[PDB]
Amino acid sequence: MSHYKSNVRDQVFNLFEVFGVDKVLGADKFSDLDADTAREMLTEIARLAEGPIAESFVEGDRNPPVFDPETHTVTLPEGFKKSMRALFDGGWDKVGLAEHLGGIPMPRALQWALIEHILGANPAAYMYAMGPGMSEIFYNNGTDEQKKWATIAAERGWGATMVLTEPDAGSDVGAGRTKAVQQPDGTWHIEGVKRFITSADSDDLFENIMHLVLARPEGAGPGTKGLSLFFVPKFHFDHETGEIGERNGVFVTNVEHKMGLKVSATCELSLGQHGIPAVGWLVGEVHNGIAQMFDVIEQARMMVGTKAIATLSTGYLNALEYAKERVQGADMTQMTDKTAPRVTITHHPDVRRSLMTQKAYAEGLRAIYLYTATFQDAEVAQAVHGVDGDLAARVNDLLLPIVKGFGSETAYAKLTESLQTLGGSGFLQDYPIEQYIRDSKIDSLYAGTTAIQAQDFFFRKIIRDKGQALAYVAGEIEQFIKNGRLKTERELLATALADVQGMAASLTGYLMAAQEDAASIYKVGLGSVRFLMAVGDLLSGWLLARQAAVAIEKLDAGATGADKSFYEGKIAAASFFAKNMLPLLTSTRQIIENLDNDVMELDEAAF
Amino acid sequence: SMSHYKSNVRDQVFNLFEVFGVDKVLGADKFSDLDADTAREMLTEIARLAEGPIAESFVEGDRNPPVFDPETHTVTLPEGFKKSMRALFDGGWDKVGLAEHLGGIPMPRALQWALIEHILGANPAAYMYAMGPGMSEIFYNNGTDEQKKWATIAAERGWGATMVLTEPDAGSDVGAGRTKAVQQPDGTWHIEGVKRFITSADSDDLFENIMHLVLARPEGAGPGTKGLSLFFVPKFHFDHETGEIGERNGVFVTNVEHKMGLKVSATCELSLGQHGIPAVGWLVGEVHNGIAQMFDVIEQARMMVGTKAIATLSTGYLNALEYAKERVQGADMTQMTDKTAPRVTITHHPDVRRSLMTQKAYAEGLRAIYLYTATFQDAEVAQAVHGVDGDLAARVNDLLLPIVKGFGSETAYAKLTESLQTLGGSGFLQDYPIEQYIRDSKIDSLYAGTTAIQAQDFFFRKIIRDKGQALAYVAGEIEQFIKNNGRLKTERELLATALADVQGMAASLTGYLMAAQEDAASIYKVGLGSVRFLMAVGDLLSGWLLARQAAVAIEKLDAGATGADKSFYEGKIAAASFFAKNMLPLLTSTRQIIENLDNDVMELDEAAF
Ligand SMILES: Cc1cc2nc3c(=O)[nH]c(=O)nc-3n(C[C@H](O)[C@H](O)[C@H](O)COP(=O)(O)OP(=O)(O)OC[C@H]3O[C@@H](n4cnc5c(N)ncnc54)[C@H](O)[C@@H]3O)c2cc1C
Ligand SMILES: Cc1cc2nc3c(=O)[nH]c(=O)nc-3n(C[C@H](O)[C@H](O)[C@H](O)COP(=O)(O)OP(=O)(O)OC[C@H]3O[C@@H](n4cnc5c(N)ncnc54)[C@H](O)[C@@H]3O)c2cc1C
């Protein structure tokens, strides 16, 4: 079969047996989507992903897109375009789209589980397919007239881009200098050069592309607060019928040569620089750009973390399948007998350590993003957690930088174990793990770097939130701890919870002390990413232990066969993670409690 | 990036001369005719050549990789890379540390590896192709008198060389190889088998001959590695008196791998005696002692791979630092609330300084480790700089090699992640060299023996079979540093805790080994902990050697260092202090983890994964 090895079984376990998402299926918004149909959709897209989507994974990397300066377009490899058509022909670009735009209403938890398969098999294919989802965001933020255009864009399946970055404005979005000049008729002319724009051209995949562009109206103030958001289509069109008209003045000028994710065209995007204006329409006809654009950034951050998690999962399952069959060496208990029988490498302790590390992190990370997603619908959060809409939104906002930051960093790090499991063969392009590594390196950088994630988590999702979402999650962990076969795990979780509490307290002290000693704030910066990572490890351990508690119940009820093996694996993973990953957080807390500004005072010339 | 390679001769000289005192042996005994000024000039010279002509083709070799012709069984290398190789040859850099009677310049191994570091940072496959004369010296040392004549010819003519062990079924388990050797009446052998993953098995027209050193099992020999013999199998027959090249020998490349990185190094399937022409081999030293003889080569390859990883992390760090110094993004964190504050360069941000100091401390701690290791590779150096005799020096060098290789490879690759991150989205571009550093360096945890194999070697052969004598020696030096100003008081306290942690790990693992006398399966816990223990010892050594460097730096600052010297020394103090406070404490948790290993993960059904 394909490079892509899916895990629908673990997704359904999470959705139904752990979080109980099936309790909202058939009711209210999801009135006409039942549990059986949800399961069938997951199986179907898993097969699509393993089949036609994964089919062009290698081709997209080995025969990457080409920029044509004669036409200012990008050409994509034919096999990848065929994969995209398989996604469109099945309507998978409308997963979770609103019903009035042509979608099937479903819990966000199911939506992201469906998307995981595309992100494991060929993640750029989902990225090119995000057009309808962007149309919905344009719809939500649009005027009544603009809602008519967004409806057309969804129905016609136009592609889309999110256009923020400039050479001098990446992390600091507010430094952007792309300009917006209002015209007599109320449209705007956008003038500027944007960088690193995903999908800025996409060959003949679509009849149009909606660029959602941040730009600064003439006379507006500085920073992100002075930015506005503009609908800038590649082609003008008839606002009533949708008929494609004249080219608009927004042109790709370059395609980047990247380590990985090569089939995703990443382009310099010039607005108003090629002799015709780039006409844009102010979104919602209000000046509120960074808030509006964050509707998109939130989804992109969720997507990036889920991509990284999807990629670790197929990396792990590839390594596991390889290890089961590779014969090498004798059993360690016979190591001095040079005539001892040769064994498969799953018999070697270091390989079992490696595989269980990969397994526990892959499944823990899957639990985290599905858990995060259960807070993205008010109805699901109410039904499965008993939490109201306001707290649910805050908890989702808390968890997003974990999914993105901790997901991105962990997946790339543990893929190292996946590749190592293949030995020298892991270094070959014949196997997919080296491409997994290259494709996933970008996940720590785009949609906000890890440092930006960690700063968001602490400054905005905890301090500005006055710790409400954080206290809620901590209370659920404490409840699980308070509650026999999981006594040792619960003790290790209690240490880990106290460690994270200590880190939060130290960092909060460093921030609060900055009012009298400005440089104190630097210790927050020094510790922020380690703190984010510690919270991710704590959440992984808790959710794995919760899974093991369910697995114990199902084994006690009489599970057999492949179910029994699955549940045994959950108990083993939970115990391994508690005993080998959580304790490190104690040393990390002590490190954070002793941070100093020596490294900030050092002359730059001494580095 | 063509001028991708950023060298650090200053840090090399600091280690060689101010810390370890390798200049004490320069101008005396074996190094009679090499003085400290010449050694420094050599470092500067190869560093310049590396930054120029050798680095020039780094990108080319990866973007325009070798092409295999299966009908001629040869590889074509890109022209720019062959021009880099010729610059290497024209300067004699393939003969660094070669024995004088083979045409080399005698020198401490610590200087030799510091010189080679520059090639490994600039274009590591170029050094690998250039290891022929080094191999010729190993062949010489293990050869008959007649073979020594051939080895002298091969060195003088600059022949390339390969080490040929691996087969599809015999990678970590070398002893599983099935390639066979059939004795001929005239005393030569015919080698029959297919080997895999052979580095440099063809090399276009770089050389007039290649020496394949091939492990094979004489017909009727016993199993495992002890049954293997080592054979000299030249690509071309040659005139044993003059070296004149003769008929093609029966050893042909039949495939060339497509790899994630290190692409310009042709990695080859090598077929011996499969094309109707015998692959004639000569039994090395005319004795049957294959695995022992080949480990002379493996030991050097493991040193090279570790030094390669370390060299690559160093130039990745310096590339990241130079980018960070110029990249303006965001406000100072003390002004984050003020959206009209001045924009600052990113070295002002705490997370970036954290990243950069993490990169620095590991790059420099790793450099200190490989150079420290090299000081035990000459008896004369180990005596002059450490006061240890030849037997202990060899055991210490053997102890440290799996650290250099296993800890060096894993650490360099992991910390290059920080280097790439420092560039932001630009770090994901091939326009910058970091993504190629990452791809080129991933292989270092795998070839010349995987990390797990390094950790098993370290524990069972270099500690237990050694009865702990080399490990006890190094521990004693760490303890003596701790026991000896109080400006390093906190660092010495942290080092003492780390030393106690590593001792605790060693005791727990040794405990599991003794328990295996009674319950065989207890040995698995040694396996589960072995790699974490190897990494822990590497962290301890890094922190100790950085603290030693800090003590030297404090002396030089106290004496009145100014300007760029002052900045250099200040950075050593900061690195040692940062590493002690942010890396070493984690070893406490790792000790407690190792103390609680169990066999649950061993007893789990494979079906449960
Ligand atoms: C493949 C790819 C696709 C992309 N697609 C898009 C797209 O479709 N749309 C779009 O708008 N953008 C896109 N981008 C841009 C991407 O979001 C930026 O690269 C990213 O936000 C980082 O910005 P930068 O590259 O300018 O790095 P910088 O902001 O210059 O960061 C450099 C380093 O400084 C650190 N740093 C910066 N500011 C701070 C701070 N205040 N505190 C602490 N550390 C800091 C960063 O963490 C990083 O380590 C893409 C980028 C890539 C690589
Ligand atoms: C680029 C490249 C160049 C190479 N060049 C050469 C060359 O010039 N000459 C040459 O002779 N070889 C060469 N090799 C071979 C290389 O040394 C082997 O790939 C390496 O030894 C690992 O062997 P293997 O690939 O068969 O992996 P395997 O031995 O199959 O290992 C697979 C996994 O099992 C683990 N494992 C295996 N045995 C044990 C054990 N007993 N205990 C615990 N874990 C175990 C490994 O650690 C790994 O995680 C090269 C390889 C590469 C990738």
Q: Are A95 and A107 in contact (CB under 8 A)?
A: no
CA A77, CA A63: separation in Å to the nearest integer? 7
Q: Is B234 helix (H, G, I), strand (E, B) or coil?
A: strand
Sign of CA dihedral A404, A406, A412, A417: negative
Q: For residue A318, give both structure tokens.
A: 């590839």
Q: A174 CA to middle of ligand 1, Å?
A: 13
Query: Environment class of residue A37 by beta-carbon count within 10 Å: exposed (0-12), middle (13-18) or buried (19+)?
Result: middle
> Distance between CA atoms of A137 and A97, rounded to whole angstroms?
10
Task: Mark A231-242 as b/e (b = at least 16 C-beta within 10 Å).
Answer: bbbbeebeeeeb
SS3 A343: strand
| Residue A45 · residue A419 · CB < 8 Å | no
Alpha helices in B403-449 (DSSP H): 408-422, 434-442
- Report the distance separating Cα B601 and Cα B599, nearest Å: 5
Other C-beta atoms lying within 10 Å of the C-beta of residue B410: 21
Measured in angstroms, the CA of A71 and the nearest CA of chain B are apart by: 24
| Comma-separated ranges of CATH 1.10.540.10 domains in chain B | 9-135
Distance of CA B176 to the CA centre of its chain: 26
Would you identify the CATH topology of the domain B158-288? Butyryl-CoA Dehydrogenase, subunit A; domain 2 (2.40.110)
Give the integer Cα–Cα distance in Å for A182 and B396.
Answer: 75
- Residue from the list B333, B413, B428 with its beta carbon closest to the beta carbon of A442: B428
Q: What is the largest CA-CA distance in chain A?
A: 89
Measured distance CA(A288)–CA(A66) in Å, rounded: 36
Q: Which of B258, B353, B360 sits opposite A429 (nearest CB)?
A: B258
The single-letter code of the amino acid at B192 is E
Across the interface, whether the CB atoms of A562 and B354 are under 8 A apart is answered: no
Helix (H/G/I), strand (E/B), else coil: A491: helix
DSSP tag of B179: -
Amino acid at A439: D
A293 lines ligand 1 (CB under 6 A): no
Map residue B187 onto helix, strand or coil.
coil
Q: Which residue type, as a one-letter code, is found at position B422?
A: T
Nearest-CB residue to B350 (from A353, A427, A600): A600
Distance CA B395, CA B471 (A): 9
Interchain CB distance below 8 Å, B260 and A429: yes
What is the sign of the dihedral through the CA atoms of B101, B107, B112 and B118?
negative
What are residue B196's phi and psi, to 5 degrees?
Answer: -130, 150
Q: CA-CA distance, B470 to A192, in Å (whole number)? A: 65
**How many residues are listed for chain B in this entry?**
609
B227 in A contact zone (CB under 8 Å): no
B chain contacts of residue A346, beta-carbon cutoff 8 Å: 606, 609
- Chain B contacts in chain A segment 111-170 (CB below 8 A): 165, 168, 170
Q: How far apart are CA A544 and CA A128, in angstroms?
A: 33
In whole angstroms, give the CA distance from residue B248 to residue B321. 51
**How would you classify the pairing of strands A209-217 and A228-233?**
antiparallel
Contact predicate B478/B495, CB 8 Å: yes
Flag whether residue A257 sits within 8 Å of chain B, measured between CB atoms: yes
Pick the ligand that lies closest to the CA of residue B330.
Answer: 1
Report CA(A458)–ligand 1 centroid distance (Å): 19
Q: Which of A197, A415, A476, A75 is nearest to B417 (CA)?
A: A415
Q: Which atom of ligand 1 lies closest to the CA of A163?
A: 11
Q: Decide the pairing of beta strands A159-163 and A244-247.
A: unpaired
Q: How far is CA B43 from CA A101, B12, B31, in A?
A: 68, 9, 16
Q: 3-state DSSP call for residue A250?
A: strand
- Side-chain-side CA neighbours of A94 within 13 Å: the count stands at 19
Q: Inform me whether the C-beta atom of residue A598 falls under 8 Å from chain B C-beta atoms.
A: yes
Kindly identify which residue of chain A lies nearest to residue B335, measuring between CA atoms.
A518
Which of B224, B259, B523 is nearest residue A428 as measured by Cβ atoms?
B259
The count of other CB atoms within 10 Å of the CB of residue A605 is: 13
User: Is residue A385 within 8 Å of residue A445, measured between CB atoms?
Assistant: no
Q: Identify all chain A residues contacting B587, using CB atoms and an 8 Å cutoff.
A: 587
Pick the residue of A264, A427, A485 with the most B CBs within 10 A to test the interface with B by mutation: A427
**Measured from the CB, is residue B213 less than 6 Å from ligand 2?**
no
Pocket test for ligand 2, best of A316, A321, A328 (most atoms within 8 A of CB): A328
Numbered ranges of CATH 2.40.110.20 in chain B: 158-288
Q: Which two tokens stand for residue A122?
A: 């060929």
Q: Out of B567, B592, B607, whose CB is closest to A605?
A: B567
Ligand 1 pocket, A408 CB below 6 A? no
For domain A158-287, which CATH number applies: 3.30.70.1450, 2.20.140.10, 3.40.50.300, 2.40.110.20?
A: 2.40.110.20
Where does CATH 2.40.110.20 sit in chain A?
158-287
Say if residues A423 and B450 touch (Cβ distance below 8 Å): yes
Q: Is B41 exposed, middle or buried (CB count within 10 Å of its CB: 0-12, 13-18, 19+)? A: exposed
CA-nearest of A377, A380, A368, A371 to A409 is A368
Q: Whose CA is nearest to atom 46 of ligand 2?
A: A423
Residue A170 three-state SS: coil
**Alpha-carbon separation of residue B223 from B176, B218, B552, B566 (angstroms):** 8, 10, 53, 60
d(CA A109, CA A99): 17
Residue B127 in tokens = 């050094």
CA distance A283 to B50: 55
Rounded-to-integer distance, Cα A549 and Cα A539, Å: 15
Residue located via tokens 């029959």: B192
- B280 C-alpha to ligand 2 centroid (Å): 27
Which residues lie below 8 Å from residue B587, measured CB to CB, with a gap of 6+?
Answer: A587, B497, B498, B501, B502, B536, B539, B540
Question: Is A393:A366 a contact under the CB 8 Å cutoff?
Answer: no
Alpha-carbon distances, residue B602 vs A2, A336, B591 (angstroms): 30, 20, 20
Label the pairing between strands A188-198 and A266-271.
Answer: antiparallel
CB-count burial class (<10 Å; 0-12, 13-18, 19+) for B83: middle
A188 touches A282 (CB < 8 A): yes
> What is the CA(B466)–ligand 1 centre distance, in A?
51
- Which A residues in the span 517-556 are in contact with B, Cβ-Cβ below 8 Å? 518-519, 521-526, 528-529
> Hey, what's the torsion of the CAs at B342, B343, B347, B350, to 10 degrees?
70
Nearest C-alpha neighbor of B441 from the set B406, B410, B402, B407 = B410
Query: Resolution of this PDB entry, in A?
Result: 1.9
Q: Please indicate the experimental technique that yielded this structure.
A: X-ray
CA distance A439 to A50: 18
Residue B362, class by beta-carbon neighbours within 10 Å (0-12 exposed, 13-18 middle, 19+ buried)?
buried
List, in order, residues 6 or more apart from A205 with CB less than 8 Å away: A76, A81, A84, A128, A159
Which ligand is located closest to the Cα atom of residue A169?
A: 1
Question: Which of B352, B424, B439 minimises the CB distance to A170?
Answer: B424
Q: Which of residues 418-457 of A touch B (CB under 8 A)?
A: 419-420, 423-424, 426-430, 434, 437-438, 441-442, 444-446, 449-451, 454
**Which residue on chain B is closest to A586 by alpha carbon?**
B589
Q: Give dist(CA B543, CA B488) in Å, integer.
A: 12
Can you tell me the distance from the alpha carbon of B451 to that of B449, in angstroms, rounded to the nearest whole number? 7
| Pick from A197, A190, A343, A348: nearest CA to A264 | A197
Tell me which ligand sits closest to the C-alpha of residue A420.
Answer: 2
Please list the alpha-helical segments (H only) found in A422-464: 433-440, 450-455
Render the burial of A338-367: b for 16+ CB within 10 Å, e for the rest: eeeeebebbbbbbbbbbbbbbbbbbbbbbb
**Element housing B247 (H / E):** strand B245-248
Nearest CA in chain A to B600: A572
Which residues of chain B have a CB within 8 Å of the CB of A434? 260, 439, 442
Tell me the chain A residues in contact with residue B581 when contact means C-beta distances shorter than 8 Å. 591, 594, 596
Please name the residue of chain A whose CA is at the shortest distance from the CA of residue B609.
A569
Q: Are strands B210-218 and B160-164 parallel, antiparallel or unpaired?
A: parallel
Superfamily of domain A8-134: Acyl-CoA dehydrogenase/oxidase, N-terminal domain (1.10.540.10)
Distance from CA of A138 to the nearest CA of B (A): 27
> Hey, whose CA ends up nearest to atom 53 of ligand 2?
A424
Pick the CATH number of B9-135 from 1.20.1600.10, 2.20.25.240, 1.10.540.10, 3.40.50.300: 1.10.540.10
At B170, is the secondary structure helix, strand, or coil?
strand
Ligand nearest to the CA of A348: 2
